[PDB]
Every structure is written in C-alpha cells, then in structure tokens.
RNA sequence: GGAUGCUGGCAUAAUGGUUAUAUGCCGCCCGUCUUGAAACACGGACCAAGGAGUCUAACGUCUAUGCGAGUGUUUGGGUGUA
RNA sequence: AUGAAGAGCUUUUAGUGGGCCAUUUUUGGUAAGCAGAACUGGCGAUGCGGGAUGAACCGAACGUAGAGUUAAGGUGCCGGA
RNA sequence: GGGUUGAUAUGAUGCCCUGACGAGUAGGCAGGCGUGGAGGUCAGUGACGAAGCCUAGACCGUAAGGUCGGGUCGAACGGCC
C-alpha cells in the first residue's frame, strides 16, 4: 500500500539485499587501495608540458 | 450515536451559480453550462467562475451523510419509520413537509421509543 | 493550360545515359525471370513499348506472370491512407533482378552451413547479425609516433 | 418514443446537432432524385449502376398468372407427404404401392433436381419438370406423369 | 503532459453482460462465468462469450450440419453444443443417436433428434455432464449467408447486390451494367 | 437529396394526400353494425338461412 | 471573390490517424491476369495430382 | 489440515536458500565491479609508465532523459521518443549503445539529455524509482519475488542481478530494460545549472551528450 | 504490507458554514456569423407566460423478442364483462 | 535494433468541404499585416506561466487539492526574487 | 486487467484488489435530473391545512435538482416500477 524507499529504511534495504549487512560490516564503501610505485615515462610528461 | 466516519470533505461548499444570474433577473441561478463560442467561462480564462466537474465529487465513504454522520431518510408514517429500527446508527428520519401536527407527535414518540434520530423535531409545534 | 500526360516530367528520367546510347546488350534478354522473383524497375527510353509509368521508376516488385517478351510485376502503391497492389506488364528491358535477394540467400545458405558445422559439437552458433558495437579497449604506442602538436592558424586572404 | 430521442439531449445546445457552419436548411441539394445525371452522379453510379436508360422489350397487359410456375426442388419432395405415412412409404420401398405426389395441389408448377431423394419409388404428378429431376426420379425407381 | 500513443479510455470493443434482459440467460451467464473463472477450461470461456452474442451472430444450426459434424472421425459419440437455436432440415432422411446441447430447439429439430434415439439438452445440464468440456463439439452457424451481407461492400467491380426493392427488367439493368448502354460498371 | 447507399424509394405523396386519409377507427363499430344487421335480417326471414 | 485553390496541408496527419497500413499478403494469391495457356494446364495438373494422392493413400 | 506450521516453515526454509544465493551472487558482483575498476586504473598507469596511451573502451550503456515537453515535436523525433518510451518530460530510460541507437539519439538530441551512468545512480534509480511491467501494469518492485517470477527465466533473481544485467550489458538487457517501467523523475532539486535549457550542453545548454555529467543531474532529479 | 501514545483548554457561536462589507491580486458583454469579437460588426431597455427536428408512408444498418423453412391472428368472420 | 499502449476485420452514421499564422524551401510583385504553392508544427477547437498589452511567439498543454522542484522569463521600486 | 455463490442477510448490473489515464469547438455516444398526462403499488400525504407563492434560514447532490423549517394560503397532492 506504500512504497518505502531503500537508501533509507534499513529494514527494506535488508529485505531487498542481504549483502548490505556485511557491506557495512567491512566498510566496503571506504575500501583502501594497495599502494603502487609506478612512475610515468619522460615522453608523457614532456609531451604534456610541451607548448 | 452516529457511526464513526472520517473528517467530511466537500471540495466546493459554494453553490455553482449561472454566469450572469447576478446581472439579469431573467437568468436564474440554477447552473447552466455556457455553450457560447466566445464564452470566457466556457474557455476558463483566469478570474472567472468555476464550472462543476466530476473531480469535485465527494468521497464515497462520506457521501450523502449529514454533519451528524447520518443519511437522511424521509418518513410520512410510523410504518415508514420502523424500517430504520435496526439502522439507527446509519440513518436519521426526516418527517415530510406535508405531515400534520398531530401525526408528527406520534412519529416523534415512536422514534424516541426506538432510538431513531429525527432531523426536524420542531415542525408544526405549538406552545 | 495544365498538362498531366503519361510521360510528363520524364525528361531526365527516361533519358538514356551519357555515352550509353544505342541498343541494349543481350544480357537483358538472356536473363531469366521466374514467378516470385524480386525485380527493380528502371525504364529504358529507347524501348518505347512496354514502358512503366514514371511512378514505378526506382520501384521494386515481385513477378506474378511471364509471357513472350514481357513480365508481370506486382507493386505496392500509396493511394491516400492505404496501399493498393498494382499489376504492370513490363518488357524486360525495363527490368533487372534485385541484388538484395541474392545477398540474403547467400546469407541463408551460409547460416545453414554454420548451423550444420557447429551442431556436430554444440557451440551455440549465434547466427543473428548484430549492429556495429562500440569499440573495445586498446593501447596506443608512441614508438616512432610521438604526438605532433598543432595550433589554429591565423587569417590570410589567399587571392 | 419521444424521451429516448436525441432531441431531448440537444436541448440547451444551439444547433440541435446540425452544425453552426452548415446550418440545416430546407433542401440544399434538391428534392428527391434530383441530380442523378448531375451533382448526384457519383452516388447513382457507385450504388445504383443501371438506373438510367431502358434495356429490353415491352409487354403490354402483362398478367402475372401466365407466368405462375413455382418451383419445387427434389430435396424436399416428401414434405408433400404427411409425417403419418412418410416413414411407412420410406421403409416399404416398393412398387405396387408407390406414393403419389400431386405437386399442383400443393401449389407447385415445376419440379427441379437440387439433390438426393432416397432410392424409394415415387409417382410425381407435375405440369413441368427438369431433365435432371426426372432422371433422378426414375433412377430412384419412380415416374413423372405429366398433368395440366 | 503525456504524448499518448493510443486512444485513451477506449472500451475493449467486446460485449459483456448480454443486453438481453432475459433472466434465464442471465442465470446461464452467472453459471458459465463462474466455470470460466474456476475450471481452467477454454470451453467455458468460449460458451460464455457466445452467450453474449447478438441474434445475427447466433445463427441457427441445422441438424444436417450436426450430422456432418458427427460424420467426422472420432466424433460419433461426442456431445454437440450449439450456443443458439437448432432448426430442422427435411433434406436429411437419417439422423444419428447423438446428444445435442443448445439454448433453444425448434419443435421439428427436437422431434427428429428424439425420434432418432437422441436427447435434447440444455447448457446447464451440459455444465453438470461436462464442466470442463468433456467430449464436446461446438458448432457455429453461417454468418455471411444473410441478406444484409449481399450489400456490404457495394461498388464498381465488387459484384455486391445493389440495395433495391423491386427487381425485374428496367430496375438497375441498364447504363452501368452493359457495354451497350454506356459502360459495364 | 440523393445520399448514402440506400434503395430508391418511390413514395407517392406529392399531391394533397392529407385531405384524403381514411383511418378505419370504425372497424369495431362497423363489425358490430354488420352483426346487428345480420341479426335483424335473420329475424325478418326468421325461418330462412 | 477568389478562394484557396489547393493545399495538401493536414493530409498526412489525416492519413496517419488510421493510415498507412500495408494492404495484406495471403498465401495462394489470385491467378488474375496470369497467362491462360498456363492456367489451362495448371487446372489439369492439379486434377491429376489430387487423383494421384487419393489413389496413393486410398 | 492444520497447515499453519509445517508448510509455513517449509516456505521460510525455501526463502532462506534464495536469500543465501542472492547474498553470494551479490558478493561476487561486488568483487567483479571493484576489479573491473581497479584493472582499468592500473592499465592506464602501466601505459603511462611504458609511454603509451590507454584508450578506454567506449561505453556500452547510456541513460536518456526527456528534457522537452510534448508540444511541437516533428514526427520522426516523436516516433523515436515513443520507441524509447519517453512519453513525458523527465522520463528516463536505459539504452544499449549501438550504431542503430546512436542515430536515434542524434535525431532526438534537441529533446533529450543523455550520457553514461554510474553504478551509484543506476542502483539509486532502481531502488527508489523501481517499477516493473507485470501484465501491462506498473508494479513497484519492493521485493525480489516479483523479479524472480517475471525474469527468473533469464537467470535473474534479485534487484541486484537486475542492476548487474543493466550495467554489465548482458544477453538479457533487452528483457530487463523492457521489464523496467520508464523512470519517472522529478525536476532537478538544485536546478539545471544553466539559465537556458534548449541549447547543447557544449553551447551552454542542457541537451545532448553530457558524457559523465549525467549522473549529477540524475541524482538531483531522483 | 499506510499513526500511535501522553497532556491540556473549551464544550460553546469557540472552530466551521452562510451572508454583507473591507482589504491584496485577478476579472472586457452575452448570444451570433467569422481565419479572427470587448469590439467603432449584428440582436438584446426590463419582467411574466407562450415559443422551434414533430407525425405519417415506404425503407436501410444495429439491437431486443417470438416462431423458425417457414412466418405474419386483428381484410374478414366467431365471441364478448363491448 | 528498438517498441507494441492489445492485432486484424466489418457495418452504419454525424459534422466538415470559407481557413489562418510561425520556422524553412519557393512563384508573381518595388513592396505589402499582398496573392499563390511545398514540408512540418500550431491557432481555429486552448485555458495556464512568460512576452507590459496581443488567436498564432517562448515555455508548457488542464479532473479536485496539498507539499516540494522547475520551464520560459526574471530578481532597484511598482513586483515575488 | 483480475478476485469473490459457501452455509447464515439484505443488494453479482453487487463487494473487493491492481495499474494507468483525465484539454476540447462542430459532432457522436452514454448515464442521470426535471415537466403534463396513463397503468400498477405505497390499504402513501391531506381542512389538526393539499397545491401554489415569499424566505442574504438549514441539509443532500460535481451538477441538473431534491429535502426540511418559518410565513402566506385554502383543496387537493405526491414517492417507487
Ligand atoms: Mg497506492
Ligand atoms: Mg438572476
Ligand atoms: Mg472561439
Ligand atoms: Mg538518369
Ligand atoms: Mg446530427
Ligand atoms: Mg444556426
Ligand atoms: Mg450541409
Ligand atoms: Mg494528466
Ligand atoms: Mg475551398
Ligand atoms: Mg531552493
Ligand atoms: Mg531558466
Ligand atoms: Mg461566524
Ligand atoms: Mg471564522
Ligand atoms: Mg464571516
Ligand atoms: Mg459582495
Ligand atoms: Mg485587470
Ligand atoms: Mg470578415
Ligand atoms: Mg474596432
Ligand atoms: Mg452596421
Ligand atoms: Mg447581418
Ligand atoms: Mg439594438
Ligand atoms: Mg416558458
Ligand atoms: Mg404462406
Ligand atoms: Mg387474411
Ligand atoms: Mg461525410
Ligand atoms: Mg460531404
Ligand atoms: Mg459555407
Ligand atoms: Mg469555425
Ligand atoms: Mg496552445
Ligand atoms: Mg523552439
Ligand atoms: Mg506551489
Ligand atoms: Mg521584492
Ligand atoms: Mg472489470
Ligand atoms: Mg457540443
Ligand atoms: Mg401548505
Ligand atoms: Mg430573494
Ligand atoms: Mg373552496
């Protein structure tokens, strides 16, 4: 009789998606990335800074 | 005593009056649609009177109910009144206009005995 | 006065061609037309017999009859709010096979070949054509292809 | 009657369903069949081909009793026998007792062969008949004896 | 607002609730809409729709038609169903022992079917004998055999029976019907 | 005046027909009169048929 | 008093209200206008074919 | 026939399995999305390191919104909008990107705003304004049983598998997107950003391809 | 898979309705022909009552009913509480 | 490929058969709020917000109400900002 | 588009659920309001006051219109099919 909106009403959110419980448990909305030591070549930077 | 009902909504408590019933006496106030080719009322220009239409209709739960919450039922005698013996919380009696004073006494007495509400318990009373 | 005749407004349409006047090559007469064949209509102006009305120039129809020198073609013609079927008796000089049907039937037999080939192993042919999809990822190298920078040029007269 | 008529519904509306531009008028295209060879020609040719002109041969003082020749098809031909004896005659498919059918007393002048009487003999008295009808009768085993 | 693709508020175009005020037909409808609602059988829906039909869409069905229908293979012991009236036909001389369910029977049809050893049945007794349409055979009568249909589609080169009261020579047999008189249609 | 596909009607009412319209309201009374006349004649020829 | 002679204004709207339907295509179309020399043989060939299938699955 | 305990418990047990399946499928889809993002990131990085350029894949999906009212539309755009199911202003639909559809969009460019949607706005749209075409009716989704009943043929069990078939344009995108009723969006809560809508997004307007700026607009409209 | 709990005041013209007036904003005279009427286009000073798609002969399509290869009692006769 | 809001079919009948405007193509004409054609969209038959004011322009099409957001157009006062 | 005859109670054209839609001249169709008279019924109202008339008094209905109260009046009049 009434459309309850997920993205509020955690109960309807969990009715639709059971993964929403562990998404919040692991904080997958704030996942950190593995650091990387990659550096661009000189051609990329000199072409970018070219006039 | 009335049956529980919602708040009664009307959506137009003002009587729809004919265009120019205020301007000409020959033009009565009973609603007539304007059927004219250049009628501002037919064309619904801003600032004109409102026309009756079905969106103004009353809720079917609160239709035909008086503010007391009863539906009016005309009666001319105790036999017509007794039809509302088991319907006192829904229907209220209205004594007809052409009923005599001495019979109004009987109808009101029987209605008080049976618990029936009467909308006009003052017509043709002397004192 | 007005003028709406049979060959009205046909000046350039029933023109023959540039450097292709004269008689018609014999392939037009050696071609073979069976009932159900799809044919396009293009009137030759040098053969005045068996011509189509200008309406049917560039129209494609289906053969319904075959005679000594002519061919019976069915066409669909818009007349107001509907289509009417029209029967023309056209000499074959004004008639050539449509290549669309040949290119469809080649695909028909190719799809049949693919289906028979891949039913021996059940690998979900997916024979339907598909539109041109978006192009996939790729990598572009600058080895010998360093970017060449450009700039808008000023205004000059050039006269 | 008057109250189920659209005239009652047009009350209030100016033109009574006839329009404001066209203005229902007395006889704007003529009276009757006026204009058959003129402004009503397309109708008379689309829906009444053959209305204009005279075709054939005249007959002065034609009486419609010289041409009284009502037709009976073979397919019925036992309706002229009552239900009481029809089954009798149909199961006793025999000569020496064959039923007689005066089609004239029933009100028919000609017999025609539409289809499939049974193989029972029948005596058929008729003013006129057809080739196929008589063929079928005598193939069933009967006979057509003519009368006047 | 809406850019509407279809016509709004359009009736289906199909009859419900037959406009005949016959109470017995209304009772048959009350039964067969229930059966169509709860039996999962298409026969009930067919019969219910047919009970809505008009007289010209309910043409009579001849006993000779029924005999044809039973001369099919596997149709001799079937129950024939006519949503309409059954008329007699003297052009047949044998009739089988079938049972026939119909709204109305003429006296001659009833007598023929009974004399042949069969029984004449109503659509309510058909409902208890065959609630899902067991072993049934629905017959409809001819619709284009009418007189009005002769005139439907009147025009040049259609051959469609002009509307005319008096027939004979000198009634629409002239110009427009023969090349000697102008043209032929 | 000629219009959609309808039969050609020959209705002969281009004279002053409303002056000559006999409506036989007298059907019943005239039957009563015939019966009374037969009765009177029978009584007058009382043995005869 | 001159008037407007001709315009095709509104005619496409009118046609497309209930319009540009293809007429339709049936199986077994008419043999009308087809060569009589072909029709005359097709009659006999179909007769013979019906006879042959009848006698075949007789 | 007590039947209030045994069959109720069996139904609950059967639902527990479907929810487990949905949970694991959704975890898999998350792992898929995050890897698909991280890998194109690292590919751009590696091409920069090698002195090359990474040309990202052209998008397979657009979200189209009707930006113009219904009056005064020529017939070809009117038909194309009816075919994309954009029959009212601020109605939205997902479109598979192909040569057959880009030309449709070029025809209806002055009447729509379109671009490339993100998982976030797809998910928000399907969860807030999520309506299915069941027996020609607009049913709010509100539960995975509707989707399992009307798309279980096509392996789809959940609103999340539906979102997946949308964004990772699958074999059954046609059927999923047709099941989805056109999104009925409000006007943007912060406004359109420009003073004047019916110029191109490039010329300072609102219509046309705003390739990745459509997410902001749609989130303001939803 | 749609609001319940607690508390207070009044229990009456207090809320509300109607009506007149004031205020803010809007609001051109109806009907009519016309592409276009507020029109410097026509009718209308006011009021009451009257006042305009009817009946018939023959028909068409549709619908309903009755019977159904038949159908139509009512020109007429018989009878009658006429 | 996309969409189908059900597809197809028939019967009967009303009103109408004075048109006009805008973008663009175009004929006559010095030109015209002129005359005449082509395509679409509109007015006619349509109120609403805007263009002070306006049949047609912009925006948008209307059951009755509430809340929110906006289109076009605007934010010195008249006038909401 | 669907659901619902099950016994006991009232209305199957009923009740209920679900979704969408709602501009309109000419014109078409449908459902209703009101008037004079006819058949039937309410063993209906009525000189203890019918009908009519007046009533910035009240109620019902989107409306057509209906109902009531008060005043005047004097002989008849209504509801439903
Ligand atoms: Mg709801
Ligand atoms: Mg007045
Ligand atoms: Mg007007
Ligand atoms: Mg050329
Ligand atoms: Mg009319
Ligand atoms: Mg007039
Ligand atoms: Mg006229
Ligand atoms: Mg709407
Ligand atoms: Mg003209
Ligand atoms: Mg704000
Ligand atoms: Mg703006
Ligand atoms: Mg007050
Ligand atoms: Mg107050
Ligand atoms: Mg006040
Ligand atoms: Mg006032
Ligand atoms: Mg003003
Ligand atoms: Mg003028
Ligand atoms: Mg003036
Ligand atoms: Mg003057
Ligand atoms: Mg004048
Ligand atoms: Mg004057
Ligand atoms: Mg009067
Ligand atoms: Mg007779
Ligand atoms: Mg007689
Ligand atoms: Mg017409
Ligand atoms: Mg006409
Ligand atoms: Mg005129
Ligand atoms: Mg006009
Ligand atoms: Mg407008
Ligand atoms: Mg524009
Ligand atoms: Mg507001
Ligand atoms: Mg201010
Ligand atoms: Mg229904
Ligand atoms: Mg009207
Ligand atoms: Mg009185
Ligand atoms: Mg007064
Ligand atoms: Mg007196």
From Swiss-Prot, chain A:
It is found in: Cytoplasm; Nucleus. Changing residue 3 to A: Significantly diminished nuclear localization. Changing residue 8 to A: Significantly diminished nuclear localization. It comes from the Eukaryota. Signal peptide: none annotated. N-terminally acetylated by acetyltransferase NatA. Belongs to the universal ribosomal protein uL4 family. Component of the large ribosomal subunit (LSU). Mature yeast ribosomes consist of a small (40S) and a large (60S) subunit. The 40S small subunit contains 1 molecule of ribosomal RNA (18S rRNA) and 33 different proteins (encoded by 57 genes). The large 60S subunit contains 3 rRNA molecules (25S, 5.8S and 5S rRNA) and 46 different proteins (encoded by 81 genes). uL4 is associated with the polypeptide exit tunnel. uL4 interacts with its chaperone ACL4 and the nuclear import receptor KAP104. Component of the ribosome, a large ribonucleoprotein complex responsible for the synthesis of proteins in the cell. The small ribosomal subunit (SSU) binds messenger RNAs (mRNAs) and translates the encoded message by selecting cognate aminoacyl-transfer RNA (tRNA) molecules. The large subunit (LSU) contains the ribosomal catalytic site termed the peptidyl transferase center (PTC), which catalyzes the formation of peptide bonds, thereby polymerizing the amino acids delivered by tRNAs into a polypeptide chain. The gene is RPL4A.
Swiss-Prot record, chain E:
Component of the large ribosomal subunit (LSU). Mature yeast ribosomes consist of a small (40S) and a large (60S) subunit. The 40S small subunit contains 1 molecule of ribosomal RNA (18S rRNA) and 33 different proteins (encoded by 57 genes). The large 60S subunit contains 3 rRNA molecules (25S, 5.8S and 5S rRNA) and 46 different proteins (encoded by 81 genes). eL18 interacts with NAP1. Signal peptide: none annotated. There are 2 genes for eL18 in yeast. InterPro entries: Ribosomal_eL18, Ribosomal_eL18/eL18-A/B/_CS, Ribosomal_uL15/eL18, Ribosomal_uL15/eL18_sf. Pfam families: Ribosomal_L18 (PF17135). Belongs to the eukaryotic ribosomal protein eL18 family. GO terms for molecular function: RNA binding; structural constituent of ribosome. The modification N6,N6,N6-trimethyllysine is found at residue 49. GO terms for cellular component: cytosol; cytosolic large ribosomal subunit. The keyword Protein biosynthesis does not apply. It comes from Saccharomyces cerevisiae (strain ATCC 204508 / S288c) (Baker's yeast). There is a cross-link at residue 115 (Glycyl lysine isopeptide (Lys-Gly) (interchain with G-Cter in ubiquitin)). GO terms for biological process: cytoplasmic translation. It is found in: Cytoplasm. PROSITE patterns: RIBOSOMAL_L18E. The lineage of its organism: Eukaryota, Fungi, Dikarya, Ascomycota, Saccharomycotina. Its main location: cytoplasm. The keyword Cytoplasm applies. This is Large ribosomal subunit protein eL18A. Keywords: Cytoplasm, Isopeptide bond, Methylation, Ribonucleoprotein, Ribosomal protein, Ubl conjugation. The gene is RPL18A.
UniProtKB/Swiss-Prot annotation, chain F:
It is found in: Cytoplasm. It comes from the Eukaryota. Coiled coil: none annotated. Component of the ribosome, a large ribonucleoprotein complex responsible for the synthesis of proteins in the cell. The small ribosomal subunit (SSU) binds messenger RNAs (mRNAs) and translates the encoded message by selecting cognate aminoacyl-transfer RNA (tRNA) molecules. The large subunit (LSU) contains the ribosomal catalytic site termed the peptidyl transferase center (PTC), which catalyzes the formation of peptide bonds, thereby polymerizing the amino acids delivered by tRNAs into a polypeptide chain. Component of the large ribosomal subunit (LSU). Mature yeast ribosomes consist of a small (40S) and a large (60S) subunit. The 40S small subunit contains 1 molecule of ribosomal RNA (18S rRNA) and 33 different proteins (encoded by 57 genes). The large 60S subunit contains 3 rRNA molecules (25S, 5.8S and 5S rRNA) and 46 different proteins (encoded by 81 genes). Present with 133000 molecules/cell in log phase SD medium. There are 2 genes for eL13 in yeast. Belongs to the eukaryotic ribosomal protein eL13 family. This is Large ribosomal subunit protein eL13A. It comes from Saccharomyces cerevisiae (strain ATCC 204508 / S288c) (Baker's yeast). The gene is RPL13A.
UniProtKB/Swiss-Prot annotation, chain H:
It holds the Pfam family Ribosomal_L30. It comes from the Eukaryota. GO terms for cellular component: cytoplasm; cytosol; cytosolic large ribosomal subunit. The keyword Translocase does not apply. GO terms for molecular function: RNA binding; structural constituent of ribosome. Transmembrane segments: none annotated. The keyword ATP-binding does not apply. InterPro entries: Ribo_uL30_ferredoxin-like_sf, Ribosomal_uL30, Ribosomal_uL30_CS, Ribosomal_uL30_euk, Ribosomal_uL30_euk_arc, Ribosomal_uL30_ferredoxin-like, Ribosomal_uL30_N_euk. It is found in: Cytoplasm. PANTHER family: 60S RIBOSOMAL PROTEIN L7, LARGE RIBOSOMAL SUBUNIT PROTEIN UL30. Belongs to the universal ribosomal protein uL30 family. Component of the large ribosomal subunit (LSU). Mature yeast ribosomes consist of a small (40S) and a large (60S) subunit. The 40S small subunit contains 1 molecule of ribosomal RNA (18S rRNA) and 33 different proteins (encoded by 57 genes). The large 60S subunit contains 3 rRNA molecules (25S, 5.8S and 5S rRNA) and 46 different proteins (encoded by 81 genes). This is Large ribosomal subunit protein uL30A. The gene is RPL7A.
């Amino acid at each position: 009789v009434l459309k309850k909106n997920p993205l509020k009403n955690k109960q309807v959110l969990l009715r639709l998606n059971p993964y929403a419980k562990v998404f919040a448990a692991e904080k997958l909305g704030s996942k950190k990335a593995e650091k990387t030591g990659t550096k661009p070549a000189a051609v990329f930077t000199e072409t970018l800074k070219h006039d | 005593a009335s049956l529980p009902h919602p708040k009664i909504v009307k959506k137009h408590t003002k009587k729809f009056k004919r265009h120019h019933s205020d301007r000409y006496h020959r033009v009565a106030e009973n609603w007539r649609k304007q059927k004219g080719i250049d009628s501002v009322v037919r064309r619904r220009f801003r600032g004109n009177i409102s026309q009756p239409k079905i969106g103004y209709g009353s809720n079917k739960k609160t239709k035909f109910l008086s503010p007391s919450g009863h539906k009016t039922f005309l009666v001319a005698n105790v036999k017509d009144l007794e039809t509302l013996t088991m319907h006192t919380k829904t229907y209220a009696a209205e004594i007809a206009h052409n009923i005599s004073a001495k019979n109004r006494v009987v109808i009101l007495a029987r209605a008080k005995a049976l618990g029936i509400k009467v909308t006009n318990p003052k017509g043709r009373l002397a004192l | 006065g007005k003028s709406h005749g049979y060959r009205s407004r046909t000046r350039y349409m029933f023109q023959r061609d540039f450097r292709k006047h004269g008689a018609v090559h014999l392939s037009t007469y050696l071609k073979v037309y069976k009932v159900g064949d799809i044919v396009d209509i293009k009137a030759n102006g040098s053969i005045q017999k068996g011509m189509p009305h200008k309406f049917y120039q560039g129209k494609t129809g289906v053969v319904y009859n075959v005679t000594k020198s002519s061919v019976g073609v069915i066409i669909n013609k818009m007349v107001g709010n509907r289509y009417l079927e029209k029967r023309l008796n056209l000499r074959v000089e004004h008639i050539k096979h449509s290549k669309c049907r040949q290119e469809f039937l080649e695909r028909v037999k190719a799809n049949a070949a693919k289906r028979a080939e891949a039913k021996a192993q059940g690998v979900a042919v997916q024979l339907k054509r598909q539109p041109a999809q978006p192009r996939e990822s790729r990598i572009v190298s600058t080895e010998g292809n360093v970017p060449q920078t450009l700039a808008p040029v000023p205004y000059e007269t050039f006269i | 009657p008057s109250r189920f008529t659209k005239t009652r519904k047009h009350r209030g509306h100016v033109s009574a369903g006839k329009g404001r531009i066209g203005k229902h008028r007395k006889h704007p295209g003529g009276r009757g069949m006026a204009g058959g060879q003129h402004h009503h020609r397309i109708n008379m040719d689309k829906y009444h081909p053959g209305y204009f002109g005279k075709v054939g041969m005249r007959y002065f003082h034609k009486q419609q009793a010289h041409f009284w020749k009502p037709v009976l098809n073979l397919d019925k031909l036992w309706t002229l026998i009552p239900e009481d004896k029809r089954d009798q005659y149909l199961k006793s498919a025999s000569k020496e007792t064959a039923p007689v059918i005066d089609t004239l007393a029933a009100g028919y002048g000609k017999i025609l062969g539409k289809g499939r009487i049974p193989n029972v003999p029948v005596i058929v008295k008729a003013r006129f008949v057809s080739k196929l009808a008589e063929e079928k009768i005598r193939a069933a085993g009967g006979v057509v004896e003519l009368i006047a | 607002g809406i850019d509407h693709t279809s016509k709004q508020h359009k009736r289906s175009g199909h009859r419900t609730a037959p406009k005949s005020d016959n109470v017995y037909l209304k009772l048959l409808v009350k039964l067969y809409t229930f059966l169509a609602r709860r039996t999962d059988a298409p026969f009930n829906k067919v019969v219910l729709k047919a009970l809505f039909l008009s007289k010209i869409n309910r043409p009579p069905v001849s006993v000779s038609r029924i005999a044809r229908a039973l001369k099919q293979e596997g149709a001799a012991n079937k129950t024939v169903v006519v949503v309409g009236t059954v008329t007699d036909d003297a052009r047949i001389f044998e009739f089988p022992k079938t049972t026939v369910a119909a709204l109305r029977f003429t006296a001659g049809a009833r007598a023929k079917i009974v004399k042949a050893g069969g029984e004449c049945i109503t659509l309510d007794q058909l409902a208890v004998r065959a609630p899902k349409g067991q072993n049934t055979l629905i017959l409809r009568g001819p619709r284009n055999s009418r007189e009005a249909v002769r005139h439907f589609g009147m025009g040049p080169h259609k051959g469609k029976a002009p509307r005319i009261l008096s027939t004979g020579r000198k009634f629409e047999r002239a110009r427009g019907r023969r090349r000697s008189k102008g043209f032929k249609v | 005046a000629i219009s959609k596909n309808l039969p050609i009607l020959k209705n002969h009412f281009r004279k002053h027909w409303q002056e000559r319209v006999k409506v036989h309201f007298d059907q019943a009374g005239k039957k009563v009169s015939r019966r009374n006349a037969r009765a009177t004649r029978a009584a007058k020829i009382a043995p005869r048929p | 008093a001159k008037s407007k002679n001709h315009t095709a204004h509104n005619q496409t709207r009118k046609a497309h209200r209930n319009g540009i339907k293809k007429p339709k295509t049936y199986k077994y179309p008419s043999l009308k206008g087809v060569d009589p020399k072909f029709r005359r043989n097709h009659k006999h060939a179909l007769h013979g074919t019906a006879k042959a299938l009848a006698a075949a699955k007789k | 026939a007590e039947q209030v305990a045994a069959e109720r418990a069996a139904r609950k047990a059967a639902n527990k399995e479907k929810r487990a399946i949905i949970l694991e499928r959704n975890a898999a889809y998350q792992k898929e999305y995050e890897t698909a993002e991280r890998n194109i990131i690292q590919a751009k990085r590696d091409a920069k390191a090698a002195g090359s350029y990474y040309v990202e894949a052209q998008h397979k999906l657009v979200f189209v919104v009707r930006i113009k009212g219904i009056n005064k539309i020529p017939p070809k755009p009117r038909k194309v909008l009816q075919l994309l199911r954009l029959t009212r202003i601020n109605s939205g639909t997902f479109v598979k990107v192909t040569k057959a559809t880009l030309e449709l969009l070029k025809l209806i460019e002055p009447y729509v705003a379109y671009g490339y949607p993100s998982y976030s706005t797809i998910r928000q749209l399907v969860y807030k304004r999520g309506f299915g075409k069941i027996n020609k009716q607009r049913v709010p989704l509100s539960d995975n049983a509707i989707i399992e009943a009307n798309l279980g043929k096509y392996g789809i069990l959940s609103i999340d598998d539906l979102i997946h078939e949308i964004i990772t344009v699958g074999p059954h995108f046609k059927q999923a997107n047709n099941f989805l009723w056109p999104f009925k969006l409000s006007n943007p809560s912060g406004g359109w950003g420009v003073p004047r809508k019916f110029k191109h997004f490039i010329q300072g307007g609102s219509f046309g391809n705003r390739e990745e700026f459509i997410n902001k607009l749609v989130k303001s409209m939803n």
